[PDB]
Write a structure and sequence with these properties.
Chains A, B: Residues 216-228 are annotated as: Active site lid that may open upon substrate/product migration in and out of the active site and close to increase the hydrophobicity of the active site, to make the hydride transfer reaction more efficient. Chains A, B: InterPro entries: D-amino_acid_oxidase_CS, DAO, FAD-dep_OxRdtase. Two copies of one chain form a homodimer. Chain A is globular. The longest helix of chain A has 23 residues, at 315-337. Chain A is α/β, with parallel strands linked by helices and 338 residues long. Chain A has nine helices and 15 strands. Chain A is 28% helix and 29% strand. Chain A folds into two domains: 1-88 and 140-195 and 286-338, no CATH class; 89-139 and 196-285, no CATH class. In chain A, helix 1 links the parallel strand 1 and strand 2 (31-36). In chain A, helix 1 packs parallel to helix 6 (141-154), helix 1 runs parallel beside helix 9 and helix 3 packs across helix 9. The relative contact order of chain A is 0.20. The structure holds flavin-adenine dinucleotide (2 copies) and the ligand O=c1[nH]cc(CCc2ccc(C(F)(F)F)cc2)[nH]c1=O (2 copies). One copy of the ligand O=c1[nH]cc(CCc2ccc(C(F)(F)F)cc2)[nH]c1=O binds next to strand 9 of chain B.
């Protein structure tokens, strides 16, 4: 079986691993390739802080609820293991702050220890009169990409730097199965008008006294257009910007100041914090994830395609459940092939 | 008014500050000295992680409940201020773990967000079937000593390195008021058989993915003889040893291994963590704090003495309420002097 994963972000590498770990057998061996135009540390996944948390609204496909929970349970079963260091996996507690009342999320029993904030906790944040507290996980994005690549190489997967211009390009090289994990750029291989970039920009800051995440919310401007502070293992991510349809991969002054002046109004200790770096990235925003089979009639033959893209602001949050579902889809392909 | 504080740990420096900040006036100026045998970074206070948390039993003098709460409120009013960095003040959440059920502490409404752990949280710790979660404060001990010394120098307080052998030694130099803040060594100036060292030893570890405190409890062996993990601003303190009556200021192998093997059974990620340093210190264990006036008939005159010692494993936790009470006691001295 010749398999080609297009993509080397979280979705592509985890799907590569999950296909091998379930379907490379004594009876059927797989050749799994990974073709990518950019690899770690140069991907969207490497920009991300990596906090597990879905959207505040219930998801469009409600299988995404399951897939997110599956991913949390996978990571919670490993957080206290000594190799958690290598994945970049750790527990964090902290705050979700709202101006007004809001109902409980469709994930509150997935996280540990979920509660509303007391008035005394709310008194710590003058701008915010409602909110939650819970404990979740961070899975650091550069670390997990490093570790996944290691696991893949160990299992004989080969990596190749190339931009694929078409599915037919792979198919004439003899891909029996193409796994399409190309994120926000998937429209270049097949037109998808439902897929758009939600551009974000972030600051990494030196503030190691920060031990909680602090997410604020302005639902009028939607998810991600309100300040957030996220302690990572070495550095704190400061963020809170979303532009639908901006394709500029460039850090800018206005977005810097929006984040700086916003996060320093959240937590004034950040005014002292050394700025270490700044990054820009594109969330693959889609109404739902596309996690789907398609069969492609390109040239002298047909080829089977597993699509796995469109994971928005939640791709680390949902990756493992998506990779196992894409593995399920690969098993259907093998069943049809007999 | 000639005042001499004996001691330059948290209790002596904060009491020095509080006396000046309340009673050095236009009408009555004070000369406040600080005599100490050791200063920062070489004191008991500098060893301490600095987590705010009293004992699990209600305190012997129940004014110590008030004094501890006063100290929490003082520090919570400042934790989000940009100068919190300089004091070493920050919020931390985390776990108090018990083998069996235990009733709620006499401080649970002082901390923010106090709750029992859920079964799912308890499932994270196999050895521990009961426990609490809450948010508290750390006040880093070397940092606050640095900052206090700065405030004192700024206000004209002078520091002198000397071991005082007697209260009469100070009194013949013309101390009108002696403030005795000598911790576990107070017995050398006046016999106190109720004061004993509770020797501890600690490891500082590089584990910056640790964002919660994790305290375990074995009430049979008492407070402090069970593993604890405490994320500080740069390094995580690993500890959990108490010896009543050990005066050996020396780190040892057995106590190292007790802590290492204990904290790594709590949280196996620590097996990867780089050990940065190790320290030994003596808690000034007494049945209650001595926070009291005495008048001393030494030589050609009498002298007024404020005692402020015996703060056990809770001296950072209670310091501010004790310093203000010792200030109250100084006001009584000034009232008697007219
Ligand atoms: C600032 C920011 C912060 C975020 N924080 C979080 C968070 O805390 N938690 C969370 O759960 N999520 C977070 N996210 C979202 C998360 O980063 C994304 O959902 C996730 O990275 C998408 O992963 P992916 O593998 O689909 O895409 P990408 O990681 O962008 O990888 C796509 C891959 O496809 C390759 N590719 C594309 N087109 C081609 C082609 N034609 N030929 C060959 N290769 C191609 C690329 O080179 C690349 O290797 C954040 C996103 C941003 C922007
Ligand atoms: C390992 C460890 C961890 C701890 N962690 C915590 C924690 O997380 N939270 C918390 O609240 N507490 C904690 N504590 C307890 C806390 O450290 C003590 O209660 C506190 O330091 C006592 O402060 P002090 O000023 O009374 O004494 P010290 O800081 O020991 O200072 C005494 C001063 O007196 C001077 N002195 C003594 N005798 C003389 C003399 N004859 N002449 C002149 N100077 C003299 C000394 O030189 C010194 O300057 C911890 C203690 C230990 C040992
Ligand atoms: O793209 C992204 N994903 C995740 C994060 C982490 C913080 C966060 C999670 C969930 C929401 C919420 F509730 F609005 F959905 C807000 C903020 N940041 C990003 O830029
Ligand atoms: O001496 C000390 N003081 C404080 C600490 C911080 C952790 C701690 C607080 C309270 C208890 C309890 F609940 F048992 F009292 C146990 C552990 N460690 C020390 O060595």
């Amino acid at each position: 079986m010749r398999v080609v994963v297009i993509g080397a972000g979280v979705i592509g590498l985890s799907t590569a691993l999950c296909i091998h770990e379930r379907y490379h057998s004594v009876l059927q061996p797989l050749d799994i390739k990974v073709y990518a135009d950019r690899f770690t540390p140069l991907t969207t996944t490497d920009v991300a802080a990596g906090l597990w948390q879905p959207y505040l609204s219930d998801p469009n496909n409600p299988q995404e609820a399951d897939w997110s929970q599956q991913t949390f349970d996978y990571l919670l079963s490993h957080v206290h293991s000594p190799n958690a260091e290598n994945l970049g996996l750790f527990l964090i507690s902290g705050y979700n702050l709202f101006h007004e009342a809001i109902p409980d999320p469709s994930w509150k029993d997935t996280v540990l220890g979920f509660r509303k904030l007391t008035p005394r906790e709310l008194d710590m944040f003058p701008d915010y009169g409602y909110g939650w507290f819970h404990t979740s996980l961070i899975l650091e994005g550069k670390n997990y990409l490093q570790w996944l690549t290691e696991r893949l190489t160990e299992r004989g997967v080969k990596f190749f730097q190339r931009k694929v211009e078409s599915f037919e390009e792979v198919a004439r090289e003899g891909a029996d199965v193409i796994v399409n994990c190309t994120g926000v750029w998937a429209g270049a291989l097949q037109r998808d008008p439902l897929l758009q970039p939600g551009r974000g920009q972030i600051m990494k800051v030196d503030a190691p006294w920060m031990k909680h995440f602090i997410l604020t919310h302005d639902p009028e401007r939607g998810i991600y257009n309100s300040p957030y502070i996220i302690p990572g293992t070495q550095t704190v991510t400061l963020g809170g910007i979303f532009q639908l349809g901006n394709w500029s991969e460039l850090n800018n002054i206005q977005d810097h100041n929006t984040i700086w002046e916003g996060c320093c109004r959240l937590e004034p200790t950040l005014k002292n914090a050394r700025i270490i770096g700044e990054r820009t990235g594109f969330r693959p925003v889609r109404p739902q994830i596309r996690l789907e089979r398609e069969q492609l009639r390109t040239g002298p033959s047909n080829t089977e395609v597993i699509h796995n893209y469109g994971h928005g602001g939640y791709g680390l949050t949902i990756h493992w459940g998506c990779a196992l579902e894409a593995a399920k889809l690969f098993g259907r392909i093998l069943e049809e092939k007999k």
